[PDB]
Amino acid sequence: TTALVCDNGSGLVKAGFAGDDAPRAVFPSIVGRPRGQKDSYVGDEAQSKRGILTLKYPIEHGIITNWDDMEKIWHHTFYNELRVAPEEHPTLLTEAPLNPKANREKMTQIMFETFNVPAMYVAIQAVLSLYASGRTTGIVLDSGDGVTHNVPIYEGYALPHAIMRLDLAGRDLTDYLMKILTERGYSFVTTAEREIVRDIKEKLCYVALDFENEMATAASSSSLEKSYELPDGQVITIGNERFRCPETLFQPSFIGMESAGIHETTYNSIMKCDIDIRKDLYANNVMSGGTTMYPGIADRMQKEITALAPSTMKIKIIAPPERKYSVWIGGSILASLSTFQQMWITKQEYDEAGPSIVHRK
Amino acid sequence: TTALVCDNGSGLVKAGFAGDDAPRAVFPSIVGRPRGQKDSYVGDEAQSKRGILTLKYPIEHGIITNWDDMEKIWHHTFYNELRVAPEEHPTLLTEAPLNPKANREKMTQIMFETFNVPAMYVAIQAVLSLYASGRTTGIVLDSGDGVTHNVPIYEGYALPHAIMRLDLAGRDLTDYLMKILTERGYSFVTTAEREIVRDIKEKLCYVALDFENEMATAASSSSLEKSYELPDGQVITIGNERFRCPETLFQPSFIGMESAGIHETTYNSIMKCDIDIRKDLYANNVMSGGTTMYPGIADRMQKEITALAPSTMKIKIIAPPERKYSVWIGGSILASLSTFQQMWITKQEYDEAGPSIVHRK
Amino acid sequence: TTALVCDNGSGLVKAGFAGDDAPRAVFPSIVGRPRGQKDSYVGDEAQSKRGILTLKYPIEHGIITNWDDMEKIWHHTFYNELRVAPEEHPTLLTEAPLNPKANREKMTQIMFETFNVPAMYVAIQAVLSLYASGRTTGIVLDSGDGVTHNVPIYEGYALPHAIMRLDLAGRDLTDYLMKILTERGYSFVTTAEREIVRDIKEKLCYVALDFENEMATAASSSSLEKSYELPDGQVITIGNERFRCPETLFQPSFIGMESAGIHETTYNSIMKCDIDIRKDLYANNVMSGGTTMYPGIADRMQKEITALAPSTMKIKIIAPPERKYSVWIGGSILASLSTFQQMWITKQEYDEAGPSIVHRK
Amino acid sequence: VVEHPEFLKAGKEPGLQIWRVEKFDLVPVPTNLYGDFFTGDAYVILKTVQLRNGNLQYDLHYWLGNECSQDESGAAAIFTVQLDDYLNGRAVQHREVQGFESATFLGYFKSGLKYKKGGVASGF
Amino acid sequence: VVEHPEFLKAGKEPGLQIWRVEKFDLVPVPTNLYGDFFTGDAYVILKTVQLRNGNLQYDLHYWLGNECSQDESGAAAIFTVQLDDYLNGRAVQHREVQGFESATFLGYFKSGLKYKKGGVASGF
Amino acid sequence: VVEHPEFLKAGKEPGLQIWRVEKFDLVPVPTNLYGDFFTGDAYVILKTVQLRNGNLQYDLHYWLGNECSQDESGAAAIFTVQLDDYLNGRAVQHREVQGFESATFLGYFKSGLKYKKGGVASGF
């Protein structure tokens, strides 16, 4: 048989087979139920049936909040997307930093008792990303669609007490971009159009190295102007919006948040760690997740941490090319190692010890 | 004449006069000897002469371990602190739960033969605290600087077979806080600075109602952050450390102990008692000692016992305002009662029956 | 023919053939009579018919109290257990220390006149045990189900004037354990459950070397905890109960007795003997009977006698591995010796001299 | 505590005996006043019942008013223990709090309880 | 990860132990080849030192060639952690990159390092 | 126990008499073998001394080898008592254990003791 790798995020599900260099299936982690049709839907069909369904996101800020919808998602992942028999494959699942013990236990229980998998495993997302970048020590900046985390890792393991979290990620960036574009007299807030804003964000947005100077530049010339062909026809163009949208990550107050920006939470995370490993961490900032894809993001982080760290500190920001899938790749690698055969948690061990064996020492 | 009340603890001595509502003298139960000065010192001077003395704690986990230093302490208590002539006052002393018969006898012998007191008495600390809270039945959680005890008491008397003990108290909490602060690049481990850590602990630390959620909260915002002005100048601030330090009482493994936490030892103590008095005990958990002063401690205990007891059980946690001195107050009240005149053990009875009369029936 | 060996105790009957290394039959010395069935029962059937019978113990504290039930027991021993014809075998019976002359005579009369044995003999239990341990001089601590005795023996014979007795043995230990377990909310006091308590006692109980320190240890950790699988299902666990139960032998007041403990009665027995044989006795304390089977018992006795004897005295406690059957084994050996043929008391001698010949010179 | 005169005459007959804690001492309450409790004080109540065979049983209640000082509630609790010991421990102890007394306790007072403000000063 | 045979014989004696990542597995390098590294591969290096009292200390290095595939650099990093855990976590971990290795690492190879082109194919 | 023939001839003259326990019986040892003891057996030794006035005194020793079976050590102890009784109780009894015999006992054998492995089978 061949193990399965499933990375569940606030916005997208990444699933596939261990040994593969990338996820075979990537769909929205959305469940649709009748709000006359009587079926409930998952992912892209759920979105296509917006008008007759009520959509919900099973995962909120990286944490599973609705287990019945989460079950549908996993069911749709096995039988529809991957087309496999769960009972047939050991499955490695991923979990967000600081996931409550109860969630880990309930995930385990459902896999074994509902899907009857022969074996399973639960890994922290940030750790899988660090591994993907060929590193055992560093601080990961993981930013996806629903949450952003700072995770300092040392010799293979996360330091829980130092983890920072920020409820600000892609979806917040899309809403903001959608807001500033609506103000200028447009409208989406629908489906193919809300789809359009996200697409404008992922294709035209970037992070400014120096926000004031970019603003001054955008105000003085059309050099930063960009155009986007709408699916209807008209061509909308944007200038300072391009970098104003992502700037929110560094200045949460742009959308009403009192929290510190990602450069500040990265610094605070490092300052919360043992003085003797901080150099390891400053020299190994690894970016992970779709919201770290913005052009300019790494240079900006490098500059802001530099302004906060000791003048002699070697500061390095690492931005892997496929960091949209780092977490999945890291899991694919892990579940593939010859040494991993004895790391799975088997049905036997479960049926004999209970969901509690999903924790470690 | 007026009786004297002396409560000897692992870290502090509480002494004064029966009839008083609080202890006149409170100093460290420390003895310093020359490690060039040739005098030996007690309490706060002993600490001031750290550099020329070797400090020892006569009481270890509530039990007297070094009688020659204990004699110095009592000498310093009478002549220096209280300024009285021992031979002049009947003295009530306190003893820890499960104190060996030999210790009780040796305490008696020293008081009579070395200090020549006219009369004395030995009371169990936990029992004096329960009395202080206006109760004859209940289970006391006494936690000071060196030891923590669970003492179930019924109609005035302790149930020895049900007593639980945990070698984890304040000093352990200060060392831990000192450890996590040193890791972040600070240093004390000295005197005025070790003094500083204890002070940070007693002013900023508190017990979390739900540890994971507090951790999540501290990781997501600065709402739990607190600052402390060091005596030099810089301002150190702490967040999750505030509740991580006291959490050790519920999870001993935070410092390397394999023992159960205080909620569990309280429960086991109750389950060791006669089924017919357990309701008395669940409804009367009385906290006592300085380490029970943490804000949040009572609510947390209430919640954890509730999760362990029968669903219909009335669970109540009592936290007296001056529980740092409950033991002394209870002794002050006891030695003052008109009925107590005939309860003392007089020199006559001693000189005639020996240290053995210090035990009961 | 082959002689029969019958050791009658307060709780168990040990019977078999001289020459054998162990008793062929071991059953409860209980007689059941109708309290509708009209038969009376002995031993294990008697217990199985609890509900329709009234159970009585023919032997009280080692002494036969009811001769009609004692006759039933012996009848059941010959015909049911051993399946032999009494008239066919010489029989050696055992008697407790300080047995009244009248009992010895009545035992003799019944054997000859009721069972028609061809020859018989009566031996003191403690003496048979000493012989079993390869010794002619020493002080035996015999403790069974109903009584405990200190028997100093010199060059083959007991010293009656020095014998000590304590009406505290196994049954008292089982009742006590049963009492403390009931207090914690359990119930037996029935049959298979009263059977359960005895079994917990014989498998989990042990004697503490130092009672206070063990108590302190049991109060400070779960290191002395033990679990027992009840026949229904639930698993009950015990800690200090394990050594609290046997401690009663050293402190009779745990169950309300004003008597001295076994270490004290052993010492008093020795001090009652001629100063010139005391060294023989201190160096030869031999344990005998089922209640001496507790792990830790020998070390504790060794320590307590040491605290009472002269500092230069060589103190040794001997604990034979099959001391549950020492008395029977010693009788088996005795009745087997080639020199024993002329020691029996024959029917002739009886029919000619009367029950009185059962005494010695 | 045999030699206090109050202990001498405690539990000698069926009925109620009510004492009030006064500066570390137990002072008997005038029988005609059984039922009135100063909310700023603490009291010890002994209920003695005679069985058909003439034997007596005891129930000890210590009542604490919402405004009593620690010394009084402390003494009341200590006195209850001592009185129980003096009665060879045969008494059953009951803590009674103002506004929440047990049915049994409330049953000792036909015309109900009267909580009056004030009381004796603390012995501290 | 106890039951891999490579882990069984890791850190049992003073000296160098060099393994190369090969299709998700750790394959030992021939002792006579210690020092040659394919730039297209990833390796795990364990340095064991014996102290004067016979106790052993460990230093783990995972070397990444500039042309190794992600699966190999990933595995090398995971193997280092596992090997460290197997050694009760006593090993100190070091990431070594081609052309920029630490002085300590370079010090393990008297006759310097030999970076040769090529290596084993990716396990993807 | 008068009628055993061994008892008849016991203590009739100054010297040593050595018997070995054999399946619940006392069997005399060949005088030329006095001193050799099978460690798996038990023996009874009678030392008879003649005083200047012709009277005899007795000292009884029962020797137990570290490998004898309970039946033998038991019989040896019972035989010693019986032999002492037959001698009107005038004998002084001594328990002797292999490797720890008393000086007196060791003194009966000029050319020391010889402990040889084995012996007679248990009578059980």
Ligand SMILES: Nc1ncnc2c1ncn2[C@@H]1O[C@H](COP(=O)(O)OP(=O)(O)OP(=O)(O)O)[C@@H](O)[C@H]1O
């Ligand atoms: N090229 C890009 N530029 C900017 N944003 C992008 C790009 N590609 C994807 N994204 C965004 O990053 C977000 C997604 O990431 P990921 O797939 O990392 O999220 P999750 O795992 O679904 O969410 P979370 O990690 O927050 O629980 C999406 O919301 C998407 O809009």
Ligand SMILES: Nc1ncnc2c1ncn2[C@@H]1O[C@H](COP(=O)(O)OP(=O)(O)OP(=O)(O)O)[C@@H](O)[C@H]1O
């Ligand atoms: N407000 C407070 N918050 C937290 N801890 C406090 C507070 N006040 C005092 N303490 C701590 O409680 C401990 C002291 O108690 P106490 O005076 O109760 O101890 P002891 O009697 O000296 O010790 P033990 O009872 O363990 O033998 C001290 O170590 C001190 O640090």
Ligand SMILES: Nc1ncnc2c1ncn2[C@@H]1O[C@H](COP(=O)(O)OP(=O)(O)OP(=O)(O)O)[C@@H](O)[C@H]1O
């Ligand atoms: N392993 C054991 N541990 C503790 N007690 C045991 C053990 N085995 C047997 N016993 C107990 O010892 C007692 C029995 O002994 P024995 O057979 O010695 O008694 P008796 O001869 O029946 O009584 P007695 O000698 O008092 O007249 C029983 O009550 C039994 O519970």
Ligand SMILES: [Ca+2]
């Ligand atoms: Ca994610």
Ligand SMILES: [Ca+2]
């Ligand atoms: Ca710099």
Ligand SMILES: [Ca+2]
């Ligand atoms: Ca204390």
Ligand SMILES: [Ca+2]
């Ligand atoms: Ca409840």
Ligand SMILES: [Ca+2]
């Ligand atoms: Ca017996």
Ligand SMILES: [Ca+2]
């Ligand atoms: Ca000695």
Ligand SMILES: [Ca+2]
């Ligand atoms: Ca008052």
Ligand SMILES: [Ca+2]
């Ligand atoms: Ca009582």
Ligand SMILES: [Ca+2]
């Ligand atoms: Ca390669």
Ligand SMILES: [Ca+2]
């Ligand atoms: Ca390590």
Ligand SMILES: [Ca+2]
């Ligand atoms: Ca033999």
Ligand SMILES: [Ca+2]
């Ligand atoms: Ca003799």
